[PDB]
Amino acid sequence: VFYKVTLSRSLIGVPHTTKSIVKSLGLGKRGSIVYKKVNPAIAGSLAKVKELVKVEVTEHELTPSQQRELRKSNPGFIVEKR
Amino acid sequence: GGLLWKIPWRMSTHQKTRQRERLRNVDQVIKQLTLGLHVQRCQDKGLTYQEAMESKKKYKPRSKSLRLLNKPSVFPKENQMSSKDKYWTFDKKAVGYRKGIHKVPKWTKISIRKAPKFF
RNA sequence: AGUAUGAAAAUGAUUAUUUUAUAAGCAAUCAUGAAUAUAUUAUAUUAUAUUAAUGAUGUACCUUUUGUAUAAUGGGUCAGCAAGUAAUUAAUAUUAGUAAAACAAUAAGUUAUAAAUAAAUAGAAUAAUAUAUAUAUAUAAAAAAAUAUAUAUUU
RNA sequence: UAGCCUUUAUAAAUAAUAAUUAUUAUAUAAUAUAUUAUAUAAAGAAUGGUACAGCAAUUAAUAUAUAUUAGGGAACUAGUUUUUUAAUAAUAUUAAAUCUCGAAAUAUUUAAUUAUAUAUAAUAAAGAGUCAGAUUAUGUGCGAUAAGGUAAAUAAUCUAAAGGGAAACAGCCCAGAUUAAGAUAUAAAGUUCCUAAUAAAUAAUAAGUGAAAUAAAUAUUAAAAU
RNA sequence: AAUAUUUAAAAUCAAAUAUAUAUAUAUUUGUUAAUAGAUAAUAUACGGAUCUUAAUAAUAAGAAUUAUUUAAUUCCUUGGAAUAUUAUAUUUUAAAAUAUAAAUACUGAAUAUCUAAAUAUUAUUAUUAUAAUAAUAAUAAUAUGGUAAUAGAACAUUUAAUGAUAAUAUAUAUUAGUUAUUAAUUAAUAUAUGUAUUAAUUAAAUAGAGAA
RNA sequence: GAAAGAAUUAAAUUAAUAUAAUGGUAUAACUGUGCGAUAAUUGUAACACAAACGAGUGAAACAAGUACGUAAGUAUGGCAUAAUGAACAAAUAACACUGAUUGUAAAGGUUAUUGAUAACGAAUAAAAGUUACGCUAGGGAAGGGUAAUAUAGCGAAAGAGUAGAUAUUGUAAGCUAUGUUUGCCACCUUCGACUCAACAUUUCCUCUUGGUUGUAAAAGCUAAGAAGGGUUUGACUGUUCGUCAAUUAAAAUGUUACGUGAGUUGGGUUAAAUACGAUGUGAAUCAGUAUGGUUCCUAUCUGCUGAAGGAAA
Ligand SMILES: [Mg+2]
Ligand SMILES: [Mg+2]
Ligand SMILES: [Mg+2]
Ligand SMILES: [Mg+2]
Ligand SMILES: [Mg+2]
Ligand SMILES: [Mg+2]
Ligand SMILES: [Mg+2]
Ligand SMILES: [Mg+2]
Ligand SMILES: [Mg+2]
Ligand SMILES: [Mg+2]
Ligand SMILES: [Mg+2]
Ligand SMILES: [Mg+2]
Ligand SMILES: [Mg+2]
Ligand SMILES: [Mg+2]
Ligand SMILES: [Mg+2]
Ligand SMILES: [Mg+2]
Ligand SMILES: [Mg+2]
Ligand SMILES: [Mg+2]
Ligand SMILES: [Mg+2]
Ligand SMILES: [Mg+2]
Ligand SMILES: [Mg+2]
Ligand SMILES: [Mg+2]
Ligand SMILES: [Mg+2]
Ligand SMILES: [Mg+2]
Ligand SMILES: [Mg+2]
Ligand SMILES: [Mg+2]
Ligand SMILES: [Mg+2]
Ligand SMILES: [Mg+2]
Ligand SMILES: [Mg+2]
Ligand SMILES: [Mg+2]
Ligand SMILES: [Mg+2]
Ligand SMILES: [Mg+2]
Ligand SMILES: [Mg+2]
Ligand SMILES: [Mg+2]
Ligand SMILES: [Mg+2]
Ligand SMILES: [Mg+2]
Ligand SMILES: [Mg+2]
Ligand SMILES: [Mg+2]
Ligand SMILES: [Mg+2]
Ligand SMILES: [Mg+2]
Ligand SMILES: [Mg+2]
Ligand SMILES: [Mg+2]
Ligand SMILES: [Mg+2]
Ligand SMILES: [Mg+2]
Ligand SMILES: [Mg+2]
Ligand SMILES: [Mg+2]
Ligand SMILES: [Mg+2]
Ligand SMILES: [Mg+2]
Ligand SMILES: [Mg+2]
Ligand SMILES: [Mg+2]
Q: What segment(s) does the record annotate as region Disordered (chain A)?
């Protein structure tokens, strides 16, 4: 099981301890998705930043490449070269 | 006070709705955190994900902060909270010992659910 | 203050195109009609260029400041000119040459090749890594603080 | 000079940052009234004395048809009672920058573990600039619980940060501009028109109260509950 | 009805959540309003217009204020189900029946994604010719606001060293094209010159001016 | 059952600690007592704390020696935190290190010790004032905020009012407004007269009205509406103000950069000259007095007063 955590809010008005926690967690920019294997340690860290973050549990995690592939929009065309 | 910080003493309807939504989101986050931990513990014992989700007896979190957050006396949910504590902080130097939450700096990020028992 | 040349700009007058006499502010940008001009592939229901219909956004520039649209500094405009350079040295770094030597070749010198110590006639494994050795304090000699020296080829 | 900034590198390198575990108690199960496992509860290893709370000791304040110690009056024949004056005791009730016997959270902070390594610490060799700061919020000192005041503490922004909101806006609420594009999610803030975007529900107001900068004691009129 | 308080969810009751559970325990929530008081000097000043509803009568308006809420309404556990609504189509007699849909409120930044482009680093490739390299191109990721400051890389100008070429050329200017463009290049036009101290690499600088 | 001992428990650190205050101290760090008088000793001190540097603090250990203790051991001054001062230049000793031709020496060094720089990181061995005759470089390293005061109002009403708190009056304390006074802050570097005034209303006069055992009348007093019109001339003083005189229906109070100096004035304030009183040794000075005494401006824009041209009628 994995927490899919997302940095919903910015870190602009945020104090330095909370910023440091966010950095440790692994979230860079706003809406930067990160999957974390569930445990007590990561849960407590997420609780510490509960108002900046959106968490949701998952069966499986996704690698960055997979996430990118999921994101990619449908090109509404099929090329045929001649 | 020649510089004009034109901030109204009370919130609009739309502001209040947004605040409520934010409060609800933090409760949801907490719920997710507890749920994931429970699922993990079920897996450790030796159940599948689906089985864990089904389980009648949900495991309560052992770490302290999480356990406190779960308690409504310490950290109440938005549905539990009073109208007043959603939209008014305690401010000892204000008249009424109360102040709009929107007047708190970084109120959109910072959480503040519980006020004192009689203030 | 040479001689030629000079569609360099500021600046003046005039003509052409275009906009402008019910509209208000860095005079621009973006949207967007219209009018005009040019176009030897405008085939057009065309393309570029010029032009304050109309709409939206838009608080000169620099300096100095916690902070300037500021009614703080400075500038009438344009043209030309106007500010981290050299010498003698020292320390770092990078590369290149040579290398336990380098530079210099007349010798002399500088740096390196040994660490110390105020200084002195002292100065690095007695059988190997420090638990050995060298120096300064101390001493009969060790120990003790400090730094340095040693595990086919010297750095 | 140190603090904060930059460049180039070094490893028998993770030492950095964040959180968890660590404790106490209960119930259940298994071994030998003890130990281990599981679950739950508890602001949960170590350090602390602010808030709060408190009146212990210290320093202060009040009351007793209460008691004692003396004094001033007063009635009968020096003894005696009452109306007392102070102190002390007793009982009850109170507060303080330099009182804390109770006592948080935040905090300081340790090991291992997990997560951050397209990431941190440390060290080495070198370059700086800066030492007039401002506002907002919270807790104070000074001031008059005055100042766009003054002095420092913590956080953020501005400083050096353009963009959206707050009519206009250095410091507030969101959010950090490599260059475009403009379909989708949106933040704060908004959705009668000016102006991009709205429909409902239940109550209350009738004063244009109010509608993004809340003006007090008090008075009048209602309304509920007892 | 009258007198007198209080304006309260601490207690109390009601409702909801969590532990054994038709009950107990613990927690959370629910208790007035209006007016007057009211007040200075360029000019009304919610930013402005303006906002308070009304039967007859609308395929139609009825806060744009205050307070508690929702995203049609009601149960069940974000989700489904039922209910009526609204719109539409069909069938039947402007109505009825059947069925399809809408229920994801929306606006909103230079936020994030998508869509492409650039540079830098990390990790994989491909092509072409310290090949463990270089150039170019892919993919995935991270980064790219900036005063004081630090670091890296370029361009214009002038001189010195080397140096083809040529009026069908070169230089300078104007106009319009081109190349992710302080620069250079193409064409046309103009004026000069029988011609670049030219391209390129080095060396250097009286080497770039809206700020004295 | 009794005596003695060992003691334990409770309380106490309120006494005492050389000395401030704080923390600590009865297991005593406090007190008494024996010995002693040594460790108020000598060389190396890691490692920490603190920390810009200079310094500061705790200190294991190694080595030499000493005192107490049966021993274990303890002592590198004081229960702790203050009790202090760099270099340079001199001075005194010890050291045996250098000895400018050699030898001595001198002189320098090492080790220990000495006195102060209190503006206390100490500029020199050694330095005060004055300028309105001044000069240069720079910095700003009435308006704005506040409303203690002031002015005005409100609530409550002690108390005056021949009687009755509320006709009229209204202690001290309470709640506000104003930005008219005197302050405070430091974002921000001229008083009066003349002339012309514009605005406010918290109204002085004029108009309307409520109350007034304290409205018989008439004069008043107090309050509500009301800013249309009006609201002074002289003597004194630079004065605004104030005192007075004579009037008036009344001689209201403000705001406007305490309106108005590119509109006038320049008496006050103000520099150069001079004198007086006081202060100073003095140059000179003054919340002093007096006589004298320096700025100018043709209007570009806005605005206002008038006057034309053009124009879409
Ligand atoms: Mg017109
Ligand atoms: Mg305008
Ligand atoms: Mg500004
Ligand atoms: Mg200017
Ligand atoms: Mg101007
Ligand atoms: Mg000028
Ligand atoms: Mg010796
Ligand atoms: Mg420095
Ligand atoms: Mg670790
Ligand atoms: Mg204290
Ligand atoms: Mg205590
Ligand atoms: Mg603290
Ligand atoms: Mg400073
Ligand atoms: Mg400065
Ligand atoms: Mg300030
Ligand atoms: Mg600055
Ligand atoms: Mg920043
Ligand atoms: Mg901005
Ligand atoms: Mg960026
Ligand atoms: Mg209104
Ligand atoms: Mg208002
Ligand atoms: Mg209750
Ligand atoms: Mg007004
Ligand atoms: Mg508005
Ligand atoms: Mg972006
Ligand atoms: Mg940049
Ligand atoms: Mg030059
Ligand atoms: Mg020029
Ligand atoms: Mg420029
Ligand atoms: Mg004590
Ligand atoms: Mg430290
Ligand atoms: Mg040191
Ligand atoms: Mg003593
Ligand atoms: Mg002693
Ligand atoms: Mg001296
Ligand atoms: Mg000699
Ligand atoms: Mg000094
Ligand atoms: Mg000093
Ligand atoms: Mg002196
Ligand atoms: Mg004089
Ligand atoms: Mg003022
Ligand atoms: Mg009386
Ligand atoms: Mg009074
Ligand atoms: Mg009036
Ligand atoms: Mg009468
Ligand atoms: Mg009239
Ligand atoms: Mg004046
Ligand atoms: Mg003028
Ligand atoms: Mg005299
Ligand atoms: Mg004369």
A: 66-82
* B5 alpha carbon – ligand 4 mean position (Å): 28
Binary contact (A51, B43; C-beta < 8 A): no
Contact by Cβ (8 Å): B61, A43: yes
Nearest CA among A37, A81, A41, A11 for reference residue B63: A41
- Tell me chain B's radius of gyration from C-alpha atoms: 19
- Residue A70: what residue type? L
Distance B3 CA to ligand 5 centre (A): 23
Which chain B residues are closer than 8 Å to A2 by Cβ? Answer: 36
Q: Solved how?
A: cryo-EM
CA distance B83 to B60: 29
Pair of tokens at residue B92: 């000892």
Tell me how far apart the 2 most distant CA atoms of chain A are, in Å. 60
What does the block give as tokens for B37? 């931990």
CB-CB neighbours of B38 under 10 Å: 21
Resolution in angstroms comes to: 5.0
